Amino acid sequence: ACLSRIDANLLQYYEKPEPNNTVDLYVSGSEYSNCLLLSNSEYICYHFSSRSTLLTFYPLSDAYHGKTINIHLPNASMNQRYTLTIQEVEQQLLVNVILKDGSFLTLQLPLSFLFSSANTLNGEWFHLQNPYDFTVRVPHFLFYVSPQFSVVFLEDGGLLGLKKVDGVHYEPLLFNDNSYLKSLTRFFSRSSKSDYDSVISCKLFHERYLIVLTQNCHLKIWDLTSFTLIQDYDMVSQSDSDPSHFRKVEAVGEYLSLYNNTLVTLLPLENGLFQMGTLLVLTYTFQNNIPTNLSASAIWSIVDLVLTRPLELNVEASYLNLIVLWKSGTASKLQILNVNDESFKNYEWIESVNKSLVDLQSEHDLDIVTKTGDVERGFCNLKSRYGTQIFERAQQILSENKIIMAHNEDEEYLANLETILRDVKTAFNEASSITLYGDEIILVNCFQPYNHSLYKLNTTVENWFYNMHSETDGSELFKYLRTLNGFASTLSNDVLRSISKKFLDIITGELPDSMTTVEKFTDIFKNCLENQFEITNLKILFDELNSFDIPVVLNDLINNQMKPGIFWKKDFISAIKFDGFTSIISLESLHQLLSIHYRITLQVLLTFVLFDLDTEIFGQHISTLLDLHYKQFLLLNLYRQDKCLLAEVLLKDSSEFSFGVKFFNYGQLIAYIDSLNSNVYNTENSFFMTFFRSSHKNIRFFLENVECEVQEFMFAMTLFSFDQSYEI
């Protein structure tokens, strides 16, 4: 797994789970969603509701303050989003929709209006029209070709053309079709409800050629200059012709995408065949069938795929990259197929983590930082973790099902909240489509508006974290970390927390500066670790530990991997305007990085308290580690205490980047996150304490912690906002 999941709820920083500026247009979103890039470098998001009666638009980078527009439809489209198109013509979002009754609706939404303050729209923003009689021959798939031309596909198998004459009116330009004549055979009827070989996927090539995939996996190719069938390939007769079962595709889906002149097709054989040939003159020419790597019966469905230029992966041998998004219920799966050479015979499947760190930690009880105790403490914890949209949706689902909080301390209630919050989140996050943000950034758009998931290329350390129980090989540092985790994972959360606390105490002076390091470690051991682990695992750890050249591995970990770089500014595109998307993606990414750092740092420190490692030789490292652990803890604490505030103080930290950042590739993003890491490990503390004062409970830990004349007064005013305060 070379990628990780960063979840972004665009409204997370704000209390209102809905933008104040919402406008409802009416014509006389949890079933489809996508992003589209416009002339102004902005991304517009859209959602088509469950019923296909509501279309919703909102600006990716300004979801809260920007305008979301709800367009209400008189009736549903004939066949969901498959009978809907959206393209930017000339400074306008042109939206066409064949509705159930047969009407062909046109929407014209000025680009200005999408980014304006206005709650009104002038002029003819919609046109109804009846060009063909769809009562007899029902269509199911609408494909945009040009501002004036686009074709319609029918359930019975026929294609209709639709040519725009003036600006509004459309007329049927029919294609020659003799496919129907197979009716003459005893094996097909015109009247039969089966037998239809309708189009399930379609792409436009070089403006002229229209490549269609049928339910029987035929690739037919139509020349729009001729309006004639040029090609007809049977995709299946190439590989092992299974007489047992080829699943004729029973719905429109994303079964092919082309890049330059290459073309991948998804054929169903246990839901596992990516054919890919080349187009050239028109001729399609096979190269190879690349199966899938999927088990647990193979019960994943394609959501979206996107063939594109290669990524920066751990294998330089690359020619093309296919991004693939599977789904199985509300669980998703993102993979990248890397093809090595121009022969499509050498390739490699690259997997990713399909749950975010925050979620994994919550599921697997690996969260040491989140404050425990009170029932309302858990309330703040969950509220802050999930965001208002989800938290309130969950509290909505509770009262509907008649689950009502008995008293302040109803633990039986909170228990229920945990589950509903998790489910609501999971639902909201159901995957719908892929967007290539920037040049190469893999973005997934979810069923619930304002919910997106970015898939982020892992750094070295992140790869180690996300592949402990895997990496066959690995460097010395990896093996070392794996063995440290091998021991630390046997300890319980309470023990680990008490140890973390003690490491804070060394910095705070609660473990007096008067003590020697050996004495503080002895204190820690006796109070926290003695009798709290299996001696067998200690022996295992000691043995494994003796294979490593510790000073070298620790050197590489501290001075290369974890302690980030001095920058001479390495182009983190300065944002002119606040970009809420990059803001939350940055903060979540930072949080993942520092959480991983935290766990590593704590495991190493642990090894320093357990074994007789010369407290003088490693004195530097130990103090660096205790310095780093501490900073880690602080940040992570602030993160779950008040994300909005953390973001605000962390972006008003960098002067030239006060408003935010833009990143168009994975290198720029990684470099920015690292940059913030540097900020954390190195003026910040003061700016943030100041902004804060102008998170009450945390600053106690962090006025006992982070304070250790100025710190004294801070402790006073903080402890006042009483005996301790007055005394100090």
XYZ file of C-alpha atoms in Angstrom:
728
model
C 0.000 0.000 0.000
C 1.707 3.123 -1.330
C -1.209 5.489 -0.857
C -3.189 6.520 2.223
C -6.674 7.935 2.719
C -7.201 11.553 3.759
C -10.840 12.364 4.386
C -12.120 15.878 3.792
C -15.421 17.233 5.000
C -15.377 20.732 3.527
C -17.556 22.076 6.352
C -15.565 20.550 9.237
C -14.161 23.842 10.583
C -17.554 25.501 10.944
C -20.460 25.071 13.335
C -23.256 25.384 10.721
C -23.504 22.061 8.841
C -24.859 24.035 5.891
C -23.633 27.094 3.935
C -25.659 30.237 4.725
C -25.696 31.015 1.024
C -27.811 28.341 -0.592
C -30.103 29.093 -3.491
C -32.937 26.977 -4.785
C -33.722 27.265 -8.466
C -36.917 25.638 -9.725
C -37.811 24.342 -13.181
C -41.292 24.397 -14.700
C -27.505 14.651 -3.574
C -26.625 11.109 -2.548
C -26.658 9.022 -5.744
C -24.051 10.575 -7.995
C -21.343 13.167 -7.527
C -18.425 14.508 -9.491
C -16.030 17.392 -9.948
C -15.353 19.410 -13.059
C -12.585 21.910 -13.709
C -13.571 25.251 -15.249
C -11.939 28.132 -17.160
C -11.149 29.951 -13.890
C -9.002 27.137 -12.399
C -11.770 26.458 -9.890
C -13.411 23.102 -9.314
C -17.166 22.886 -9.289
C -18.786 19.937 -7.585
C -22.131 18.524 -8.492
C -24.487 15.987 -7.011
C -27.471 14.262 -8.529
C -29.892 13.176 -5.824
C -31.161 9.652 -5.153
C -34.343 10.341 -7.090
C -32.513 12.189 -9.888
C -34.864 15.101 -9.198
C -32.279 17.436 -7.676
C -28.990 18.714 -9.047
C -26.631 20.493 -6.670
C -23.564 22.619 -7.400
C -20.923 23.962 -5.030
C -17.359 25.324 -5.290
C -14.762 22.789 -4.086
C -12.427 25.425 -2.647
C -15.069 27.553 -0.906
C -17.890 25.262 0.187
C -18.877 27.215 3.304
C -18.764 30.849 2.203
C -19.370 30.176 -1.482
C -22.754 29.485 -3.015
C -24.375 26.116 -3.288
C -27.144 25.982 -5.854
C -29.981 23.498 -5.774
C -31.728 23.045 -9.089
C -35.060 21.288 -8.692
C -36.348 19.182 -11.591
C -40.005 18.650 -12.531
C -39.435 14.888 -12.767
C -36.552 12.438 -12.696
C -34.269 11.810 -15.667
C -34.990 8.759 -17.823
C -32.047 6.767 -16.506
C -30.288 8.619 -13.670
C -27.040 10.535 -14.302
C -26.557 8.352 -17.379
C -29.191 10.520 -19.059
C -27.456 13.698 -17.950
C -24.542 15.714 -19.299
C -22.652 18.740 -17.991
C -20.006 20.606 -19.943
C -18.630 24.107 -19.949
C -19.448 25.693 -23.300
C -18.513 29.408 -23.239
C -18.464 30.927 -19.729
C -21.465 28.732 -18.885
C -22.322 25.356 -17.409
C -24.419 23.728 -20.099
C -26.448 20.893 -18.640
C -28.671 18.623 -20.670
C -31.048 16.061 -19.206
C -33.457 13.687 -20.891
C -36.302 13.381 -18.406
C -38.566 10.387 -17.794
C -41.556 11.709 -19.763
C -39.347 12.161 -22.822
C -38.562 15.871 -22.525
C -35.054 17.097 -23.262
C -34.166 19.780 -20.716
C -31.400 22.314 -21.241
C -29.865 24.314 -18.414
C -27.605 27.301 -18.900
C -25.866 28.454 -15.745
C -23.523 31.404 -16.193
C -20.045 30.883 -14.727
C -20.443 34.248 -13.005
C -23.663 33.132 -11.291
C -21.888 30.062 -9.886
C -19.323 32.255 -8.146
C -21.508 35.286 -7.495
C -23.378 36.340 -4.365
C -26.693 36.562 -6.216
C -29.714 34.501 -5.172
C -31.486 35.374 -8.404
C -30.883 34.369 -12.023
C -31.944 36.342 -15.090
C -32.748 35.195 -18.618
C -33.613 31.791 -20.018
C -31.562 29.455 -17.828
C -33.663 26.479 -18.908
C -35.356 25.151 -22.027
C -37.792 22.240 -22.248
C -38.106 20.450 -25.578
C -39.524 17.347 -27.264
C -37.386 16.439 -30.277
C -38.094 12.681 -30.457
C -40.874 10.341 -29.283
C -39.183 8.405 -26.459
C -42.454 6.774 -25.437
C -42.007 4.056 -28.075
C -38.211 3.549 -28.050
C -36.836 4.334 -24.614
C -33.321 5.806 -24.369
C -30.930 5.112 -21.496
C -27.603 6.834 -22.176
C -26.784 10.411 -23.235
C -23.310 11.231 -24.561
C -21.962 14.758 -25.212
C -19.882 15.218 -28.377
C -19.890 18.973 -29.041
C -21.836 22.164 -28.072
C -24.292 21.476 -30.919
C -23.941 17.713 -31.360
C -24.384 14.744 -29.084
C -25.788 11.234 -29.584
C -28.500 9.279 -27.767
C -28.366 5.547 -27.043
C -31.486 3.410 -26.822
C -32.394 0.364 -24.764
C -33.273 -1.645 -27.872
C -29.818 -0.983 -29.310
C -30.345 1.927 -31.669
C -28.499 5.206 -31.820
C -30.135 8.571 -32.366
C -28.314 11.732 -33.394
C -29.137 15.144 -31.976
C -28.043 18.196 -33.958
C -28.381 21.772 -32.701
C -29.375 24.207 -35.459
C -29.884 27.637 -33.804
C -29.062 27.863 -30.075
C -31.846 25.837 -28.524
C -33.608 23.468 -30.921
C -32.425 19.904 -31.495
C -33.209 17.427 -34.292
C -32.778 13.629 -34.696
C -30.075 12.642 -37.197
C -30.535 8.859 -37.355
C -27.699 6.403 -37.858
C -27.928 3.447 -40.248
C -28.669 0.347 -38.217
C -28.915 -3.192 -39.601
C -27.978 -4.922 -36.344
C -31.698 -5.475 -35.784
C -31.845 -8.008 -38.669
C -30.468 -10.701 -36.289
C -34.147 -10.893 -35.398
C -34.431 -13.107 -38.472
C -32.571 -15.807 -36.521
C -34.462 -18.160 -34.173
C -32.233 -16.934 -31.330
C -33.403 -13.320 -31.231
C -36.650 -11.346 -31.388
C -37.414 -7.626 -31.734
C -40.215 -8.128 -29.205
C -38.016 -9.856 -26.634
C -37.101 -8.065 -23.406
C -33.747 -9.880 -23.512
C -31.589 -9.918 -26.670
C -30.825 -6.180 -26.509
C -27.141 -5.447 -26.908
C -27.282 -1.851 -25.685
C -24.332 0.481 -25.104
C -22.919 0.478 -21.561
C -19.893 2.706 -22.144
C -18.844 5.273 -24.735
C -15.903 7.541 -25.601
C -15.167 10.175 -28.243
C -11.877 9.845 -30.126
C -10.276 12.659 -32.115
C -13.646 14.483 -32.243
C -14.841 12.147 -35.007
C -14.755 8.516 -33.895
C -17.271 7.225 -31.369
C -16.149 4.074 -29.513
C -18.969 2.076 -27.942
C -18.977 -0.941 -25.629
C -22.049 -3.155 -25.638
C -23.604 -5.422 -23.014
C -22.148 -8.429 -24.799
C -18.803 -6.665 -24.670
C -18.663 -5.846 -28.304
C -16.556 -2.859 -29.188
C -18.350 -1.176 -32.066
C -16.819 1.929 -33.659
C -18.865 4.650 -35.361
C -17.453 7.227 -37.768
C -19.376 10.497 -37.253
C -18.158 11.765 -40.589
C -19.843 8.810 -42.274
C -22.455 8.121 -39.604
C -21.603 4.496 -40.423
C -20.503 1.460 -38.423
C -16.777 1.155 -39.196
C -15.701 -1.443 -36.672
C -17.153 -4.327 -34.697
C -14.813 -6.336 -32.437
C -15.836 -9.184 -30.175
C -13.742 -8.478 -27.098
C -14.346 -11.896 -25.539
C -13.237 -14.299 -28.290
C -9.617 -13.363 -27.654
C -9.094 -14.762 -24.166
C -10.233 -18.228 -22.945
C -13.678 -18.602 -24.417
C -15.548 -19.773 -21.320
C -18.801 -21.466 -22.325
C -19.813 -21.483 -18.653
C -20.590 -17.806 -17.921
C -19.722 -14.426 -19.343
C -21.830 -11.858 -17.529
C -23.362 -9.644 -20.177
C -23.235 -6.239 -18.530
C -26.649 -5.441 -17.134
C -26.248 -1.692 -16.562
C -24.455 1.392 -17.802
C -21.117 1.861 -16.078
C -17.543 3.029 -16.436
C -16.070 0.114 -18.376
C -13.501 1.953 -20.488
C -11.376 5.091 -20.599
C -8.761 6.167 -23.134
C -5.704 8.382 -22.781
C -3.873 9.187 -26.014
C -4.376 6.361 -28.485
C -4.422 3.620 -25.832
C -7.717 2.069 -24.690
C -8.525 -0.070 -21.673
C -11.820 -1.990 -21.448
C -13.285 -3.767 -18.416
C -14.564 -7.233 -19.242
C -16.388 -9.379 -16.635
C -14.786 -12.749 -15.968
C -15.106 -13.079 -12.209
C -15.181 -9.259 -12.569
C -11.551 -9.340 -13.577
C -10.287 -8.402 -17.028
C -8.686 -5.193 -18.193
C -8.149 -5.498 -21.918
C -6.109 -2.745 -23.436
C -5.188 -2.194 -27.017
C -4.260 0.710 -29.199
C -6.233 2.843 -31.599
C -4.647 3.922 -34.831
C -4.959 5.003 -38.447
C -9.591 3.432 -37.914
C -8.137 0.315 -36.265
C -8.262 -1.153 -32.755
C -5.471 -3.625 -32.055
C -5.285 -5.907 -29.023
C -2.172 -6.048 -26.830
C -2.954 -8.028 -23.685
C -5.590 -8.968 -21.135
C -4.548 -7.919 -17.635
C -6.545 -9.653 -14.911
C -7.354 -8.129 -11.546
C -6.113 -9.081 -8.130
C -9.269 -9.424 -6.095
C -10.399 -12.139 -3.712
C -12.997 -12.718 -1.008
C -15.000 -14.116 -4.003
C -14.428 -10.983 -6.160
C -17.468 -8.927 -5.184
C -16.233 -5.479 -6.053
C -17.952 -3.227 -8.557
C -16.270 -0.667 -10.759
C -17.102 2.882 -9.731
C -14.799 4.783 -11.996
C -11.529 4.261 -13.805
C -9.138 6.770 -15.322
C -6.254 5.940 -17.629
C -3.563 8.617 -17.529
C 0.074 9.712 -17.527
C 2.350 7.899 -15.088
C 2.748 8.737 -11.425
C 5.739 9.005 -9.099
C 5.602 5.477 -7.685
C 8.223 3.284 -6.022
C 8.974 1.738 -9.433
C 10.646 3.941 -12.080
C 9.737 1.351 -14.747
C 6.486 2.995 -15.824
C 4.739 3.838 -19.088
C 1.098 4.281 -18.146
C -1.130 4.347 -15.089
C -4.702 3.169 -14.677
C -6.470 4.468 -11.599
C -9.237 2.131 -10.514
C -11.979 2.563 -7.962
C -13.922 -0.475 -6.821
C -16.834 -0.574 -4.394
C -18.484 -3.260 -2.270
C -21.266 -1.732 -0.225
C -20.036 1.436 1.463
C -16.500 0.019 1.546
C -14.234 1.215 -1.259
C -10.998 0.058 -2.868
C -8.509 2.190 -4.760
C -5.862 0.602 -6.932
C -3.359 1.750 -9.517
C -2.295 -0.511 -12.347
C 1.185 0.434 -13.460
C 2.183 -0.666 -16.940
C 5.952 -0.782 -17.293
C 6.547 -0.738 -21.025
C 4.796 -0.190 -24.359
C 4.029 -3.870 -24.361
C 1.069 -4.253 -22.032
C 2.424 -7.546 -20.746
C 4.658 -6.285 -17.961
C 2.688 -4.544 -15.216
C 2.233 -4.306 -11.436
C -0.782 -3.736 -9.166
C -0.411 -1.079 -6.474
C -2.874 -1.089 -3.576
C -3.746 1.625 -1.057
C -5.191 2.061 2.410
C -8.958 2.309 2.112
C -9.599 3.778 5.538
C -8.157 7.003 6.987
C -5.727 6.962 9.919
C -8.305 8.549 12.234
C -10.799 5.790 11.366
C -8.288 2.936 11.626
C -7.094 4.229 15.007
C -10.677 4.505 16.216
C -11.595 0.996 15.003
C -8.453 -0.705 16.331
C -8.221 1.216 19.634
C -4.806 2.631 18.739
C -5.642 6.177 19.829
C -3.569 7.209 22.833
C -4.038 10.990 22.581
C -7.825 11.597 22.793
C -8.760 12.623 26.355
C -10.721 10.064 28.375
C -13.038 10.457 31.336
C -16.342 12.284 31.347
C -19.407 11.406 29.293
C -19.479 15.016 28.006
C -15.746 14.683 27.400
C -16.610 11.868 25.017
C -19.230 14.205 23.560
C -16.678 16.915 22.790
C -14.371 14.172 21.522
C -16.857 12.797 19.003
C -18.265 16.199 18.019
C -14.771 17.536 17.298
C -13.752 14.317 15.547
C -16.707 13.950 13.184
C -17.846 17.483 12.348
C -21.284 19.007 12.714
C -22.859 17.639 9.508
C -22.337 14.048 10.567
C -22.782 14.578 14.313
C -26.162 16.244 13.791
C -27.219 13.702 11.169
C -26.469 11.013 13.766
C -28.410 12.846 16.450
C -31.230 13.066 13.910
C -31.202 9.311 13.331
C -31.192 8.732 17.106
C -34.405 10.635 17.947
C -36.242 9.190 14.940
C -35.479 5.735 16.336
C -36.591 7.018 19.770
C -33.147 6.846 21.363
C -33.087 9.762 23.847
C -30.393 10.803 26.355
C -31.528 9.907 29.882
C -29.188 12.179 31.853
C -25.774 13.903 31.743
C -24.093 10.609 32.339
C -26.017 8.176 30.109
C -23.085 5.997 28.914
C -25.562 3.645 27.229
C -26.425 6.557 24.927
C -22.845 7.577 24.040
C -22.227 3.941 23.099
C -25.017 4.311 20.495
C -23.570 7.605 19.234
C -20.232 5.899 18.538
C -21.878 3.466 16.128
C -24.288 5.860 14.414
C -21.492 8.404 13.895
C -19.314 5.685 12.326
C -22.165 4.540 10.014
C -23.265 8.047 9.011
C -19.622 8.843 8.211
C -19.296 5.612 6.245
C -22.503 6.333 4.274
C -21.535 9.952 3.593
C -18.219 8.583 2.314
C -19.666 6.055 -0.171
C -17.565 6.489 -3.307
C -19.092 7.821 -6.523
C -16.372 8.974 -8.921
C -12.766 9.980 -9.472
C -11.431 13.464 -10.116
C -7.821 14.157 -11.035
C -7.262 17.304 -8.989
C -4.354 19.307 -10.386
C -2.169 17.303 -12.743
C -1.985 14.025 -10.868
C -3.865 14.226 -7.546
C -6.263 11.309 -6.987
C -9.542 12.574 -5.553
C -12.691 10.567 -4.837
C -16.082 12.262 -4.607
C -18.557 10.880 -2.087
C -22.338 10.383 -1.983
C -22.838 13.074 0.637
C -22.220 16.662 -0.487
C -19.150 18.340 1.057
C -17.524 14.937 1.491
C -14.485 14.025 -0.538
C -11.566 11.671 -0.012
C -8.077 12.488 -1.238
C -5.722 9.558 -1.787
C -2.204 10.680 -0.885
C 1.110 9.203 -1.996
C 2.890 7.923 1.086
C 6.287 9.141 2.198
C 8.953 6.615 3.189
C 8.026 6.615 6.882
C 4.327 6.396 6.033
C 5.023 3.337 3.889
C 6.783 1.768 6.853
C 3.855 2.574 9.117
C 1.239 1.269 6.706
C 3.216 -1.883 5.875
C 4.613 -3.357 9.134
C 2.956 -6.787 8.674
C 3.889 -7.046 5.016
C 7.160 -5.635 3.707
C 9.108 -8.808 2.833
C 12.350 -6.893 2.521
C 12.788 -3.372 3.855
C 15.851 -1.445 4.940
C 17.548 -1.783 8.325
C 15.539 1.129 9.697
C 12.278 -0.541 8.647
C 13.213 -3.854 10.261
C 14.222 -2.010 13.420
C 10.927 -0.153 13.556
C 9.024 -3.387 12.880
C 10.679 -5.079 15.833
C 10.031 -2.103 18.112
C 6.386 -2.216 17.084
C 6.492 -5.970 17.579
C 7.176 -5.341 21.244
C 5.139 -2.166 21.832
C 1.989 -3.644 20.262
C 1.794 -6.204 23.093
C 1.417 -3.448 25.702
C -2.044 -2.029 26.401
C -3.296 1.524 25.800
C -3.367 2.522 29.480
C 0.272 1.509 29.902
C 1.364 3.357 26.771
C -0.542 6.488 27.846
C 1.054 6.431 31.280
C 4.442 6.192 29.614
C 3.668 9.068 27.254
C 2.590 11.137 30.259
C 5.878 10.377 31.998
C 7.826 11.532 28.939
C 5.883 14.772 29.095
C 6.732 14.948 32.809
C 10.459 14.903 31.992
C 10.060 18.053 29.925
C 7.626 19.734 32.342
C 9.852 19.163 35.321
C 7.175 17.137 37.147
C 9.942 14.625 36.967
C 12.502 17.070 38.445
C 15.438 18.273 36.350
C 17.454 17.298 39.446
C 17.150 13.578 38.619
C 19.552 11.810 36.303
C 18.187 10.371 33.082
C 18.735 6.866 34.456
C 16.704 7.816 37.535
C 13.765 9.195 35.503
C 13.799 6.070 33.335
C 13.861 3.938 36.493
C 10.914 5.899 37.888
C 9.055 5.419 34.607
C 9.844 1.690 34.548
C 8.766 0.941 38.103
C 5.567 3.018 37.887
C 4.454 2.118 34.340
C 6.092 -1.005 32.874
C 7.072 -3.397 35.659
C 4.759 -6.444 35.669
C 2.964 -4.959 32.630
C 4.525 -7.039 29.827
C 5.516 -10.618 28.997
C 9.223 -11.254 29.642
C 9.187 -13.568 26.608
C 8.478 -10.624 24.309
C 11.243 -8.694 26.059
C 13.679 -11.486 25.176
C 12.424 -11.519 21.566
C 12.939 -7.741 21.382
C 16.418 -7.805 22.936
C 17.544 -10.512 20.525
C 16.168 -8.763 17.448
C 17.635 -5.466 18.752
C 21.138 -6.924 18.909
C 21.307 -7.330 15.112
C 21.069 -3.583 14.490
C 23.757 -0.914 14.423
C 21.624 1.309 16.639
C 23.529 4.650 16.460
C 23.381 4.584 12.641
C 19.721 3.588 12.330
C 18.679 6.158 14.944
C 20.811 8.757 13.179
C 19.022 8.089 9.897
C 15.616 8.083 11.591
C 16.062 11.320 13.569
C 18.271 13.415 11.263
C 16.918 12.313 7.867
C 13.464 10.733 8.050
C 11.763 12.596 10.894
C 13.520 15.966 11.167
C 12.467 17.836 7.992
C 14.416 20.094 5.636
C 15.581 23.711 5.696
C 13.707 25.404 2.863
C 14.947 28.096 0.548
C 11.307 28.279 -0.480
C 10.507 25.402 -2.830
C 7.458 26.744 -4.633
C 4.358 26.090 -2.525
C 2.070 28.150 -4.814
C 0.879 30.971 -2.603
C -2.880 31.154 -2.428
C -4.456 34.509 -3.205
C -7.692 33.500 -1.487
C -8.512 31.099 1.320
C -8.741 27.585 -0.060
C -10.768 25.535 2.391
C -10.084 22.297 0.536
C -6.309 22.503 0.595
C -6.596 23.811 4.149
C -8.377 20.717 5.530
C -6.391 18.325 3.319
C -3.184 19.864 4.638
C -4.282 19.695 8.254
C -5.473 16.080 7.990
C -2.270 15.080 6.180
C -0.132 16.787 8.796
C -2.127 14.975 11.469
C -1.502 11.598 9.880
C 2.220 12.292 9.536
C 2.615 13.487 13.119
C 0.509 10.635 14.507
C 2.836 8.141 12.799
C 5.849 10.109 14.051
C 4.347 10.046 17.543
C 3.971 6.275 17.595
C 7.505 5.704 16.322
C 9.058 8.230 18.741
C 7.217 6.674 21.667
C 8.321 3.145 20.740
C 11.983 4.214 20.528
C 11.852 6.145 23.803
C 10.315 3.001 25.322
C 13.331 1.010 24.193
C 15.495 3.659 25.881
C 13.802 3.182 29.255
C 13.864 -0.647 29.114
C 17.540 -1.340 28.260
C 20.930 -0.151 29.527
C 21.738 2.167 26.627
C 24.489 4.607 27.558
C 22.541 7.630 28.696
C 25.569 9.728 27.805
C 26.282 8.416 24.265
C 22.626 8.701 23.258
C 22.026 11.759 25.443
C 21.559 13.936 22.410
C 19.078 11.582 20.708
C 17.090 10.991 23.867
C 16.652 14.705 24.436
C 15.820 15.259 20.819
C 13.238 12.464 20.997
C 11.697 13.746 24.188
C 11.618 17.152 22.547
C 9.938 15.697 19.435
C 7.443 13.476 21.276
C 6.332 16.370 23.233
C 5.713 18.573 20.255
C 3.905 15.714 18.575
C 1.633 15.220 21.549
C 0.872 18.897 21.719
C -0.075 19.209 18.077
C -2.228 16.111 18.105
C -3.956 17.339 21.207
C -4.713 20.689 19.670
C -5.882 18.945 16.539
C -8.660 17.062 18.300
C -9.386 19.987 20.597
C -10.146 22.588 17.927
C -9.257 21.872 14.286
C -10.434 25.248 12.931
C -8.292 27.141 15.459
C -5.314 24.851 14.822
C -5.538 25.451 11.063
C -5.925 29.195 11.641
C -2.839 29.501 13.858
C -0.855 27.086 11.654
C -1.476 29.027 8.429
C -1.139 32.486 9.984
C 2.229 31.096 11.142
C 3.741 31.279 7.654
C 3.746 34.947 6.600
C 4.007 34.736 2.808
C 1.532 31.855 2.920
C -0.908 33.474 5.260
C -3.973 32.764 3.112
C -3.108 29.160 2.323
C -1.490 27.133 -0.514
C -2.137 25.497 -3.946
C -0.558 22.196 -4.973
C -0.886 20.584 -8.373
C 1.188 17.437 -7.821
C 2.144 14.963 -5.071
C 5.645 16.390 -4.671
C 4.320 19.894 -3.966
C 1.858 18.461 -1.445
C 4.350 16.241 0.381
C 6.762 19.198 0.448
C 4.099 21.495 1.933
C 3.128 18.962 4.651
C 6.821 18.455 5.480
C 7.094 22.266 5.638
C 4.353 22.401 8.254
C 6.112 19.572 10.071
C 9.215 21.788 10.223
C 7.091 24.602 11.622
C 5.874 22.252 14.392
C 9.329 20.873 15.300
C 10.978 24.317 15.293
C 7.112 31.949 17.506
C 4.467 29.314 16.760
C 3.661 28.491 20.406
C 3.290 32.207 21.209
C 1.181 33.087 18.179
C -1.104 30.156 18.956
C -1.433 30.697 22.692
C -2.178 34.354 21.912
C -4.805 33.628 19.248
C -6.365 30.992 21.525
C -6.626 33.302 24.530
C -8.094 36.142 22.464
C -9.644 24.775 24.360
C -9.622 25.624 28.084
C -8.953 22.097 29.396
C -6.039 21.160 27.107
C -4.043 24.248 27.919
C -3.806 22.891 31.449
C -1.848 19.914 30.277
C -0.141 22.398 27.984
C 0.440 25.024 30.652
C 1.910 22.310 32.811
C 3.514 20.934 29.691
C 4.040 23.680 27.147
C 4.996 26.347 29.690
C 8.076 24.364 30.747
C 8.818 34.883 33.689
C 6.625 34.841 30.584
C 5.550 31.200 31.092
C 4.772 32.092 34.703
C 2.370 34.922 33.825
C 0.822 32.685 31.157
C 0.281 29.971 33.749
C -1.323 32.583 36.012
C -3.803 34.092 33.553
C -4.601 30.615 32.215
C -5.201 29.111 35.656
C -7.423 32.112 36.431
C -9.654 31.918 33.341
C -7.819 30.104 41.609
C -5.403 29.303 44.437
C -2.667 28.166 42.045
C -3.110 31.289 39.918
C -2.865 33.726 42.840
C 0.105 31.869 44.358
C 2.107 31.781 41.116
